[PDB]
Amino acid sequence: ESQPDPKPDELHKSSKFTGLMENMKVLYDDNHVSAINVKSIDQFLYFDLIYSIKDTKLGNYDNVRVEFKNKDLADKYKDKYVDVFGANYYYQCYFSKKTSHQTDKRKTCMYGGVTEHNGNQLDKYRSITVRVFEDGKNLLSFDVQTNKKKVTAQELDYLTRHYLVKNKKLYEFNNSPYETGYIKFIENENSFWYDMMPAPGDKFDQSKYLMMYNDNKMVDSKDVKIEVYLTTKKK
Amino acid sequence: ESQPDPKPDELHKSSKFTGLMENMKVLYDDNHVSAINVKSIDQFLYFDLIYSIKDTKLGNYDNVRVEFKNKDLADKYKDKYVDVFGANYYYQCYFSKKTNDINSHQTDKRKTCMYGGVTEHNGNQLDKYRSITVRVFEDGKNLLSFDVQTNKKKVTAQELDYLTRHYLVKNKKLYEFNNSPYETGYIKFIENENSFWYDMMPAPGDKFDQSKYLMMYNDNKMVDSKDVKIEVYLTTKKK
Amino acid sequence: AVTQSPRNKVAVTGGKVTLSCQQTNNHNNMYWYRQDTGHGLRLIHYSYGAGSTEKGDIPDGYKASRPSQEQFSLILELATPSQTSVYFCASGGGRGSYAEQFFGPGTRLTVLEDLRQVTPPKVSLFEPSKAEIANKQKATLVCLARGFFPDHVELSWWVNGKEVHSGVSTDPQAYKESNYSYCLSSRLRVSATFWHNPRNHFRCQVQFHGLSEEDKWPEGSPKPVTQNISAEAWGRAD
Amino acid sequence: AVTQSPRNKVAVTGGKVTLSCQQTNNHNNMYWYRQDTGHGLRLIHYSYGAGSTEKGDIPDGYKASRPSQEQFSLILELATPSQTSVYFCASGGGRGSYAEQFFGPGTRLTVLEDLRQVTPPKVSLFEPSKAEIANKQKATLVCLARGFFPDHVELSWWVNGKEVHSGVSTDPQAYKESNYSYCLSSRLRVSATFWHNPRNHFRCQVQFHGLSEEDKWPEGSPKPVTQNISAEAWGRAD
């Protein structure tokens, strides 16, 4: 482990949140952004990149603003053909307005989720394994596919939670069947985790939560073991 | 007496009315229509007359539609110089619309309605203001009495009634926003041997129709300013 | 524009119900309220934008969803009599900032424990008398709709094929004449000569909204798919 | 348009308060509502035309008057704490028909049993740091008003003597920091270069509404007749 493991009393208790879990749920539902082999078409601020990605299905957007943790990340991907994938939001998705601007009609926002296209593709779809423990008891386990060599943690986080939402009711309209939960991404000896439950209060900010993905943290699809730890509600 | 006096169990009981007495009070507040030496400028229906009476104060109207009990009353005053005085209303005041292609109308902007309140101007004026007396009895006990001025020989009951209830409102809180301090009440207009009375309280229910109430004035009932003794009988609330 | 779907709906207890709202104002904020005679207009759930769902004054027993900028739905998974109310949708400015919001026509929803309780109204034309008071006229024509349920009705007056408003005195809201039956009256004051003119035609319309094609009717009995009922008359002699 | 007078008002218990409403729509109906966090928007009194005043959901404790087509006043003769709320006027269509009504800007009314409780705010400028998070920027400058009572306040941003709206994030509504004290925040996200430009002038204005000339200020203590407070700063080095 590299990042100190979450101590029990460090995790967000879902019961302390009283403001509709539907805002979290929505992020890990069937909808999300995905682009393959595309180049940025504009930029709002030094730390973001506007991608022409149309919502082929729902039709909610045409352009996606991808904000990063710093200017370096943006410049690094600016005018470079990459692949995009991530949980997006609309509420506080403020960007451009009209030409650093561009963008006419339908738009959404996200963080990180950028990876190079060439030299990162794989013939056969990789299959990582998720070990979910419910009060330590590892009752559930499933596989998460992909075909990128250096896949971002975000793409895996979405893929993992998605399964849990549909099969384990991870997130519900108003709350969750779990008190606490965190997803642990382990590579070699290094490991990092993310808190799956919202902060205390009566309101959830999708924008601030997702901002945890702005580091554009990538993981090696061959050296990754994912483990989800959940505590149930003591009914 | 001519009109049989109001039998106790015949008067409206204010407590049976649950719909804001303000709608009644308003009819007897400082505001009312008044026109001196004016002729009608149009007519909506055979039973009404449109006059050009501008509300110099509140500016709530420019034309006043005076409705009558019958066509005869209208024709009688149609194109005759008169004086107008009465408690008007706005809510259900529909009239004319725009002088039309079949409908005899007009009236451009701001308008109100009323019933009767018409008297000839010439030969009806008095140099000095006549002063009638009001005998108000609260449960028989004549505790209040005051005078009502006027300067017409043949003054309408409506004008006196308004002038009477008006004083009562400001000094006895006859009509309040929600209700009244009195259970029943009626004003008795006695001329000579002949006499008539008016029920001062609204009909039972939760809504007061000003248009229907004022309609009791469409007869344009006049009264001799020298042969009139006004008497108001009110019943207090048993708190 | 803010459109609501459906406009009227009667459902059984325990059934699922979803009310949709479509706006064309490109508003980020959208709301779902419920009007109740006694209570005012209460906010159930609102939205700040697509994918946003916040709870209002009374979220209890209601879910919602803002799939896009133009759609915001109110979901009742376990419908109950308590949810019988007229619902209003809006869009625009901030919560509590009505001057910025734009409302929809409203949706009447009634939750009953048996659709077979739904019965169309009985409309009739009447006429009072001065002998019936020591007052004056009160009102000429009278219409009375009764025996209907639920109370999804609209009453109107049409003299000579044209809708009138002058002299119309309709009941503020239908009253219950029994456990499962509503009543509703109206009055039309016209001129004596008008009523006495045998050439004039009067009409009292009553629009009842019961079950529809989307409603699951218990096969067997006749499905109450009635609509507009009228009571007509002509001017009578002097 | 629908105008409300006054827009803010703090009164003492037992005092008489009158809220006026002016419309330029030439609408027959006019309404007076009160919004309360918890309950919805409740009708107090309404009108059908000049001289008409009908009662709504909650008439108890209030009077009204429709002296003309353009005016509908709300009157509180014996003000009670219970009447503290935001009052909304409206004009237009019928009762319950929100799609036809036009609302006014609302009136903040607070009924206190002691005007000595009124206190102006304390406005201050701050600056956060990325070190406090593992996110990105969040917000540049931060403005916070606290220690004021009641909650009659407005916060705005003015960079270089010109009001801005880009990057402004103000609290939806002032929160109570104690029994008789409120709080309110805002943040202004500007470019690092602009912030680092020592020639730029930033300002956060806060409009606090308290006692006026009409208010019976119990003499002696200084009368809380404060108004617009400002927190200003310039750009700092790179």
UniProtKB/Swiss-Prot annotation, chain A:
It is found in: Secreted. Belongs to the staphylococcal/streptococcal toxin family. One of its GO terms (cellular component) is extracellular region. The gene is entB. This is Enterotoxin type B. Lacks the zinc-binding site found in other members of this family, such as staphylococcal enterotoxin A, C2 and D, thus it possesses only one MHC class II binding site. Keywords: Disulfide bond, Enterotoxin, Metal-binding, Secreted, Signal, Superantigen, Toxin, Virulence. Gene3D superfamilies: 2.40.50.110, 3.10.20.120. Interacts with MHC class II molecules composed of alpha/HLA-DRA and beta/HLA-DRB1 chains. Interacts with T-cell receptor beta variable 19/TRBV19. It comes from the Bacteria. GO terms for molecular function: metal ion binding; toxin activity.
